[PDB]
């Protein structure tokens, strides 16, 4: 399936959840990309204008694609695989309550998983992996990709 065929990848935050401090959204998204560039040759850069490879969006309900959100709970976010246009883009459900911590739904953890999809990774059946199909909070100050997540990404890049 698709992968990015270039090493410098850009992203852009289309808009910001009111759930968080802005700088906290910026840092959570940045840390999430870093998790992946730590184990691949990819470099990620935030641009503020123009067309990014990966558009980061907060939206609720029906939001102009075929992956309508469902209110609070259920689906937290979704992302498109590598490709032009909406390819790569990662959408976060505004009906969730985004946080830097264990309360609500953690944006950083969610963003890690969604960026995995943006890079072309699918799901793992291993509950330790961030790409397990269903969300499970783990302490983010000590967060590490599982060996399973590492083999998956390294089967696509590097
Ligand atoms: C932190 O990882 C997760 C973030 C969101 C979800 S999810 O929101 O339950 N499912 C979407 C469609 C997905 O697999 O991307 C499941 C796991
Ligand atoms: Ca939801
Ligand atoms: Ca895109
Ligand atoms: Ca919200
Ligand atoms: Zn969407
Ligand atoms: Zn997923």
Q: How many angstroms separate the CA atoms of 52 and 31, rounded?
A: 18
Alpha-carbon span 94 to 74, nearest angstrom: 12
DSSP state of 151: H
From 114, 118, 119, 145, the catalytic residue: 114
> Cα(55) to centroid of ligand 2, in Å?
19
Task: Give, using CA atoms, the residue closest to atom 1 of ligand 1.
Answer: 110
| Distance (Å) from CA 48 to ligand 6 centroid | 26
Going from N- to C-terminal start, the domains of the chain cover 1-158
Residue stretches of the annotated binding site for Zn(2+): 63, 65, 78, 91, 113, 117, 123
Pairing of strands 54-59, 90-93: parallel
Encoded tokens for 107 = 């944006």
Q: What is the largest CA-CA distance in the chain?
A: 38
User: What resolution does the deposited structure have, in angstroms?
Assistant: 1.9
Rg (CA), the chain: 14
CB 28 within 8 A of CB 35: no
Phi (first) and psi of residue 128, to 5 degrees: -85, -15
Q: Are 32 and 56 in contact (CB under 8 A)?
A: no
Task: Please say if 23 is a catalytic residue.
Answer: no
Q: Order the strands of the 90-93 sheet from edge to edge.
A: 43-46, 8-13, 54-59, 90-93, 77-79
Environment class of 81 (CB within 10 Å of its CB; exposed 0-12, middle 13-18, buried 19+): middle
With a 6 Å cutoff on the Cβ, whether 67 touches ligand 1 is no
CATH of domain 1-158: 3.40.390.10
| Close Cβ partners of 15 (under 8 Å, ≥ 6 residues apart) | 57, 58
How was it solved?
Answer: X-ray
Using a 6 Å cutoff on CB, does residue 135 contact ligand 1? yes
């Amino acid at each position: 399936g698709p992968v990015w065929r270039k090493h410098y990848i850009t992203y852009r935050i289309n808009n910001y959840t009111p759930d968080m401090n802005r700088e906290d959204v910026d840092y959570a998204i940045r840390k999430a990309f870093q998790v992946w560039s730590n184990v691949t040759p990819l470099k990620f850069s935030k641009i503020n204008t123009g067309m990014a490879d990966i558009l980061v969006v907060f939206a609720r309900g029906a939001h102009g694609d075929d992956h309508a959100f469902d209110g609070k709970g259920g689906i937290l976010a979704h992302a498109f695989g590598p490709g032009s246009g909406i390819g790569g883009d990662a959408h976060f459900d505004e009906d969730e309550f985004w946080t830097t911590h264990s309360g609500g739904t953690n944006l950083f953890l969610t963003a890690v998983h969604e960026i995995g999809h943006s890079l072309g990774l699918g799901h793992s059946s291993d509950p330790k992996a961030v790409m397990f199909p269903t969300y499970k909070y783990v302490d983010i100050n000590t967060f590490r990709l599982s060996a399973d997540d590492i083999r998956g990404i390294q089967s696509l890049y590097g």
